[PDB]
Structure formats: structure tokens, C-alpha cells
Enzyme design. Structure first.
Site, PDB file in Angstrom:
ATOM      1  N   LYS A 161     -18.488 -17.518 -42.870  1.00 24.89           N
ATOM      2  CA  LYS A 161     -19.703 -16.839 -43.279  1.00 24.89           C
ATOM      3  C   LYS A 161     -20.358 -16.240 -42.045  1.00 24.89           C
ATOM      4  O   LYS A 161     -19.934 -15.180 -41.577  1.00 24.89           O
ATOM      5  CB  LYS A 161     -20.581 -17.786 -44.097  1.00 24.89           C
ATOM      6  CG  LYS A 161     -19.888 -18.284 -45.352  1.00 24.89           C
ATOM      7  CD  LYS A 161     -20.732 -19.262 -46.150  1.00 24.89           C
ATOM      8  CE  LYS A 161     -19.885 -19.985 -47.174  1.00 24.89           C
ATOM      9  NZ  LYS A 161     -19.324 -19.048 -48.171  1.00 24.89           N
TER      10      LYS A 161
ATOM     11  N   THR B 288      -0.466 -26.001 -41.431  1.00 19.96           N
ATOM     12  CA  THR B 288      -0.359 -25.099 -40.291  1.00 19.96           C
ATOM     13  C   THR B 288      -1.731 -24.828 -39.677  1.00 19.96           C
ATOM     14  O   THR B 288      -2.722 -24.627 -40.383  1.00 19.96           O
ATOM     15  CB  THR B 288       0.292 -23.780 -40.726  1.00 19.96           C
ATOM     16  OG1 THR B 288       1.600 -24.040 -41.247  1.00 19.96           O
ATOM     17  CG2 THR B 288       0.414 -22.820 -39.550  1.00 19.96           C
TER      18      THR B 288
END
Ligand SMILES: Cc1ncc(COP(=O)(O)O)c(C=O)c1O
Ligand SMILES: Cc1ncc(COP(=O)(O)O)c(C=O)c1O
Ligand SMILES: [K+]
Lengths: 476, 479
Positions: free
Chosen positions: B268, B298
Site C-alpha cells: 500500500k 520462494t
């Protein structure tokens, strides 16, 4: 009164991991896009050769991947700036989902933050919506599948690894009408074993079960186009048809194995050189996940440039089978050398070269000597990733690991085994053997390994992939 | 369930009938033309007013420069997990910057804050089976899911009702382990938690605090460290990067120091993707060592981490980003007030516009984008209670008054076209969510007049270009 001793509990639990030597020390490894497969440590002057990365086709640094990132950043910036429902739905997302659907020849595909999230979301939703579901799970399934099955909160049976006799007996114990899910992987990465996908599909048909297949360690690497082991199951039918669905399977039947699997999950963070996860399935299943999975709905969409990079890698690898034949040939080169030296590679018919150690402390020491003395980076693998007492060094060759580099690795590992007096093949035999130290023959046959890019259907080169309605919602 | 397709069809049909079935909008945000985006066609441009790119840093030159340079050096994917080939300098710098921002011993980065919330809450309940969780009723879905996964006893307390919270905490011995889980800023109506009083309750009744600052980081406090930092605004501003010796009341510990676990997002204000928890190094090592959602995935791409790091560092020493956002939000709120456009009152950066009907909210959103080239998404059930549907407007430093004037006139016109209720109409029916309620006292803005007059020259020089040392705990602690 006095409060609960939270720090004391944390200390005791971490101390236990120190005691059993599963406490983990991460290695600072900075992979060099211009010098693949080299990386540097804390300092740029200290370079090592990375031999344990899951960037299986070296596509994380491919010029087409990086160019797609750069161009997308210039236009879109960094973050997506929202979720799929709010401001986070865009063209890179649509193209990526469509490419993944095309790769697996499925009606649709849905992208998640990671395959961990995708597995958790899919498995969680199946059990929450079908409370009578019975899940049948391979004992070696990845943590993300174990977690998803737990979150499903339904009855489950664990069958011994790749034991299809036990699986069938478990399936037989129920009426056909009971809803069932068989959850398994195509390639189990820590020892490199492979599931018999066609037989599991046969069992699913007979006993009325859905199939959930995790191809994280096969996408990019198996089948003519890298669509996974499911594609490899009908290798010539898919090669002939290219991007199109074949009219018949390799055995002359109506449906290919990849077509028969209900849900296929994969990652974008390994062969496809990026980050993310997905499920490929019928458009009804895709819309179901899109509409109900909170781990899909309530999180920020991945950055556009990350999706564009994965898309470029998917498209490139689809029409470059030489990436796969090259990887396999390099793995076979290393495996043959280690076999002649008695280096205990767990036998597998896949691209993985796991070297058995059997002790967590000795595995760390071997990895440390490799990186510090030989400038070779192979991380020691220990619990929870593998069972205690099966600790190993996991080596993953790529198209970039040419024989000149492999020779250096081979000599280095040979030297570390001598320096630490680690058990060789014959020494594991003296103790009764472990994890195979009957070998399955390689998935990639001699005939398949001789194929070139000129043997692929021209329709997999630069295909025009239309976006899917289901990625945005289906209008009635 | 042997007929799987029938069950799937049936459940999807139910969502179509209750009109919770979602149609996503193709929106391609333009880094060079913020806050404009284009739809399916590049010529079809709209003004985005519902993005959570709160400071417009997803397109900031230092963020994009960091990505481009990191890509050329590192490539795209990290190529592994934190344990196997996926641990690197961008990760170390990002975690150290996040720990520095929250003045915590450590921070741990996850794929997303959804994953971070799920991971932390899941582990707390897995390892403490006697844990009792006290959860604010308006907590985000990721916190609800995490608490469910914790699989422990839970109490849901009425939103921001600290009398009920205390009654619930009192019903247990102090020795029972407890967790109070809440947010600083709740995004749908923009209300704010009283973090200090919750910390007081946590001390008294022996509870850990878990605080989600997703909608506050970048936006509150002198350095954007969140509402917890805003609670001791002057102590943190004076000390800059350093921990203050005392809090704004002269006490020993600041509110931000007292919160045990703080989660945030990188997706954000920080213009990227990802999530994190900031906490003591022992808690961080605990999550690092045990949380499967951290271990078995990952690592985020180096360039994504580098972009977030650049945004964090820039926003830390640019308080004008925060004063600018607040002034733009107040500009919109004032105009809507004079027009009778029903904004749910709130002391934050969010401008929720009350509609009161799901279909009318969707229709207003459709007219805004198709007729007025204004993109504001309608917020409906389950996100908010039926009958409280609203349009969520989120101004940023890039939404200048000229753009706000277009927005204001567009919403006014849509209200007239659809006959939507104004403030006085809600006033006639008894009011809702503070709109048109007699004797309702609005919470004062978190950003005071005095704070809004601060400039970047009023920040401690040690927050500009700080040298942030990497943390041992990010790699594991050698004893
Ligand atoms: C309060 C809150 N917490 C957590 C999250 C999840 O954040 P992320 O997008 O990084 O997964 C959100 C995002 O919608 C949120 O609003
Ligand atoms: C078999 C398997 N499934 C799923 C995952 C999760 O993949 P991702 O990194 O995209 O979260 C992994 C990654 O290690 C894996 O090995
Ligand atoms: K002070």
C-alpha cells in the site's frame, strides 16, 4: 498474580532446535544476472558458484524476462496498488493467467501470491465446502499441501509414498458416492522421485475422486513444452499438437493425462524465474476459487512487472525444448561422475542431484567447507524440510551449468567428502542403505533428449494467447 | 458430493443471486500520469480514487530507480527460499529498514501481510494451546483466518469497546496466556483503535498485543511508522531514528515500544508487495524458525524488496507526504460536508461515502467510471454489513485540489441522477454510522493542526540518509 512466561516458552522451543541441530543459518547469496550461475556473498569480491538454486532454466536473468520487467515498470510502476477486486486487476494479470491456462491446456488458470498460498487456498476451500470430503495424501507431500489439508478440516488418509496398492485399498474402503480428493506431487524435490500420474487418474475414475496435482518442481522441465510430468505422460501427442489439444493420447485413448487431472498447481518462482503461484483447471473450478478463496481475494495483487517477467519466461521456455534437454544432460553428467566416485546421490529419474549426508551437523559442515574453501554454494537441507537423519546436499543443475563448471563441483564435493571422511555409497551399503543409496529410468529418454526446437510445432512459437473471461468473472 | 460440478454450480449461483459475485475491472495505472489509469484500451483513461497506493510511491523515481538497478544486477526472481539460495542483501536491508521504522529489535518479511498475519497468529495458537485470543469484531479477513488457524479459544469484542475487552480479560486469571489482536486503522470506515489503552489492559491482564498497522504505515507518526508512533508523536520526532528515552507523557516506554507484534504491508503506502512483522528478536527468530508460511515459499524478487526499501527510506524523512495526503482528504471531506454528501465520519485519511444499498452503490460506481471517468469501487457485503454499503475514496499526495473538484462534482451529479440519500435524509431516519446522528461527537483528526504545519525541516536530520545496519536475526543468531 504473575503473567505467563512467553519468552521462556519461545526460548525453550528455539533451544530444542539448537540441540537437534535443525536451527538454521541462512547464507547471504546475491545471484549475478550477468554472471549466471555465479553469486557474491556479503562482499562483491567474494564470488561463489550457485549449485542449489531452483531457477531451474536460468530464466530469472533471461534478457526477454528482464526487458519485460523494465518496460512494464516504466509504464505501471512497482506495486499493483490494490487487490483483484479493487484497483489490482490489470492486463499483465490477464495475460499471465491466460498463458498458464494455455500451457496446461486448461480452460482457465488463477494466479496467487505464491504456490504455497495457492495450495492452501485450493485445498482449504475443497474441505470447507465439502465437509464429507475424504482426502488421500501422499506421505511426502509438501508442507503447503499438509497445511492446506489440515485447514480443509476433513477426514484424511496418508498413504505410504507412491504406494498405489495402499492408496487403492484406502479408496476401496468407502462407497464411490463419498466425495474424495487424491492430493500428490509430480516430482518430489528432496529425493526427486516421480508419481505415476496416469495410474492415480485411473484410481480416481474408478473410485470417484478428484485429483489435485502439485507440479511445482516439474513445470518448465517436463513435457515437450515444459507443462509438467502430466504433459510428459503424453509426450508425442502434445509435441505433435503443440499449443492445441491432441485428439488422442499416446496410448490411443480419448483424453490426455494432463486433461484428466482436475487441478494442477505450479509456481512462478522456480523455472519461470519470478514469484507467484497458480492453479489450472476447468473454468468452473477457477471461478469457484476466484469467488470464494480469501487468500486470493483479500491480498494485494503481485506487481505488474513480476507477472510480465513470468509471462515472458513461460512463452520463451514453451518453444525452447533445448532448455530441458540441456538441463537433463548436465544433471546426467554430474550424476555419472558422482556414481564413479561413490558420491551418495539418492537415485531418482529427475533433474535433482541430492547427496545423502544423514547428519544435520555434518551436512552444515560440508556446506560450509564447500562455500568457504571451494567457493561452491550448496545449502545443507535438514528438518523440517527433510526427515531427521536424512539430511542432504541438494544440487540442481541448469542449462547454465556446463561441464567445465560441473568438473569443479565434482572435484570440490569429492574433496569435502575426503576432508570430513563422509560415508560413500559403499559405506551406506555397509549400514543397510538409505533412500535407495530398483532405480527408475530417467523420465527423459534418449530419443526425447535428441529433440531440438525444430521438432516443436510452429504454433508454440509466438502464439497469440487470448485473455480469459473467467479471470474477470463470467457474465450470464 | 459425488456430483462435484453440481455443487460448484450451486454455490456460484448463490453468489450471483445474492449479488456478491464479483466482476473485476481492468485498470492499468500509469506511473507517468498518476493517479490516472487506462482500461482495456490505452486511450480509455480514468482517474483512480480507490487505490491503496496511499502516498503515490509505487511510481516514485527512487522506487523505480531501485527496481531497474536491482533487476540488471540480480535479475527477476530470487531463485530460492530463505534457506536455499533465496537469502540476499535486498532482503537483509528491507528487514533492517522495517525494524528501524518501528524501532523494534527485528522484522521478518513474508510474501504478503495476509501471509504474515496468518503465520504469526497460527504459530501463537499452535505453540500455546491454552492461549485465549481477544479479537476486535472488525478485524481483517487475514486476522480472522489466522485466529481460526490458531485453533484456540477466542472472544470477539464489540468494535473498539474497551469496557467489554476489559470485562473479557478480567474473567481469566492473569497467568492464562492471552493475545489481543486488533488494527490501528480500520479501512472500511476509517476508525482508529486506542492503542495506548489496549497496551494498558495488556499489561494489567498479562496479554501479548498483536497490532495490524496495514492502513497506517506511511501515513501516521512523524516518520510514517504508524498510529503507534503517532501516540508519542513529539518523542519520536525529537529522537528521529533513535529510540526516545521517555514517551510523550514522560513515562519509560512509548506505545510503539510496548506493542509486542506489529504487522504491516509493503503493498500500500510502500508501493510494492509483501508483508512483515516487527517485534523482539526472539519473537522474530521464533517465526523465522517455525512458521511454515515463511519457510516453505520462494523469497520475494530482489527488485520488489529494493523498491519497498526505497519507498520506506524516502517516506521516513518526507513528512510532507503525510501532511499533503491529510490536507487533500480534508479538502474532499469539507466539500462533501457542504454538499450533504454522506461521508462516514472518521479521524483518518479515508473518505467512505455512505450509500446504504448494494445495487445503488454498484450503479453509482458504474456511472462514475463510465460517465465521469472516475474510478471508485463500491464496498458491499461481506466487507461491510448489508445496508451500510459505501464508496471508498482514498486521496493521496497526488490528488490535487483540481482533481478533487472534478471528483466532488461527479459524485454530486451521480447522487442527483440516482436520487441517493443526502446527510439530511439520513438525519431524518435516525442516522447511521455517525451520519446524521443527533448528539454525535466526531473523533478529532489524528493529525492536529500543529502537526499538519510541520515540514521536512522539522524532522531530525538522522532520519535523512540513515545508515541502517543489517540484523543478525535475519540470518539466524549465532550464540
Ligand atoms: C487490515 C489489513 N491487514 C492485512 C491485509 C493484507 O495485506 P497484503 O495485501 O499485504 O496481503 C490487508 C489488505 O487488504 C488489510 O486491509
Ligand atoms: C512441492 C512444492 N509445492 C509448493 C511449493 C511452494 O511454492 P512457492 O515458492 O511458489 O510458494 C514448493 C516450494 O518449495 C514446493 O516444493
Ligand atoms: K519524551
Amino acid at each position: 498474580e504473575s503473567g505467563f512466561d512467553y519468552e521462556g516458552l519461545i526460548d525453550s522451543e528455539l533451544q530444542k532446535k539448537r540441540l537437534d541441530k535443525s536451527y538454521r543459518y541462512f547464507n547471504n547469496i546475491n545471484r549475478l544476472a550477468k554472471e549466471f550461475p555465479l553469486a557474491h556473498r556479503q562482499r562483491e569480491a567474494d564470488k561463489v558458484t550457485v549449485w542449489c538454486s531452483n531457477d531451474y532454466l536460468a530464466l530469472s536473468k533471461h534478457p526477454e524476462v528482464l526487458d519485460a520487467m523494465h518496460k512494464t515498470i516504466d509504464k505501471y510502476g512497482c506495486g499493483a496498488g490494490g487487490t483483484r477486486n479493487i484497483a489490482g486487476h490489470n492486463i499483465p494479470t490477464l495475460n499471465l493467467e491466460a498463458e498458464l491456462a494455455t500451457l496446461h491446456k486448461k480452460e482457465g488458470a488463477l494466479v496467487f501470491s505464491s504456490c504455497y498460498v495457492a495450495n492452501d487456498a485450493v485445498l482449504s476451500l475443497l474441505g470447507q465446502k465439502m465437509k464429507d470430503l475424504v482426502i488421500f495424501s501422499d506421505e511426502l507431500n509438501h508442507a503447503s499441501m499438509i497445511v492446506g489439508i489440515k485447514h480443509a478440516n476433513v477426514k484424511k488418509h496418508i498413504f505410504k509414498h507412491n504406494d498405489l496398492n495402499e492408496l487403492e485399498q484406502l479408496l476401496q474402503s468407502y462407497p464411490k458416492s463419498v466425495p474424495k480428493l487424491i492430493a500428490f506431487e509430480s516430482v518430489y524435490s528432496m529425493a526427486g522421485s516421480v508419481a505415476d500420474i496416469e495410474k492415480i487418474c485411473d484410481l480416481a475414475d474408478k473410485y470417484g475422486a478428484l485429483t489435485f496435482l502439485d507440479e511445482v518442481h516439474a513445470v518448465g522441465l517436463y513435457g515437450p513444452h515444459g507443462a509438467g510430468v502430466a504433459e510428459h505422460c503424453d509426450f508425442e501427442s502434445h509435441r505433435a499438437s503443440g499449443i492445441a489439444t491432441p485428439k488422442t493420447n499416446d496410448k490411443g485413448g480419448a483424453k490426455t493425462v494432463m486433461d484428466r487431472v482436475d487441478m494442477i498447481t505450479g509456481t512462478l518462482g522456480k523455472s519461470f524465474g519470478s514469484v507467484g503461484g497458480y492453479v489450472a483447471a476447468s473454468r468452473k473450478l477457477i471461478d469457484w476459487f476466484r469467488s470464494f478463496a480469501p487468500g486470493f481475494i483479500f491480498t494485494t495483487t503481485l506487481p505488474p512487472s513480476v507477472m510480465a517477467g513470468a509471462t515472458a519466461a513461460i512463452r520463451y521456455q514453451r518453444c525452447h525444448i533445448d532448455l530441458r534437454t540441456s538441463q537433463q544432460k548436465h544433471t546426467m553428467y554430474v550424476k555419472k561422475a558422482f556414481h564413479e566416485l561413490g558420491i551418495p546421490v539418492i537415485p531418482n529419474p529427475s533433474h535433482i542431484v541430492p547427496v545423502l549426508i544423514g547428519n544435520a551437523d555434518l551436512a552444515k559442515q560440508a556446506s560450509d567447507i564447500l562455500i568457504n574453501k571451494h567457493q561452491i554454494y550448496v545449502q545443507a537441507i535438514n528438518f523440517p524440510t527433510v526427515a531427521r537423519g536424512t539430511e542432504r546436499l541438494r544440487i540442481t543443475p541448469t542449462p547454465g551449468h556446463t561441464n567445465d563448471l560441473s568438473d569443479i563441483l565434482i572435484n570440490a564435493v569429492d574433496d569435502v567428502f575426503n576432508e570430513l571422511q563422509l560415508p560413500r555409497v559403499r559405506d551406506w551399503e555397509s549400514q543397510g542403505g538409505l533412500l535407495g543409496v530398483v532405480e527408475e529410468s530417467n523420465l527423459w529418454t534418449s530419443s526425447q533428449l535428441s529433440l531440438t526446437n525444430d521438432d516443436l510445432n510452429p504454433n508454440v512459437r509466438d502464439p497469440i494467447v487470448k485473455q480469459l473471461e473467467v479471470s474477470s468473472g463470467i457474465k450470464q
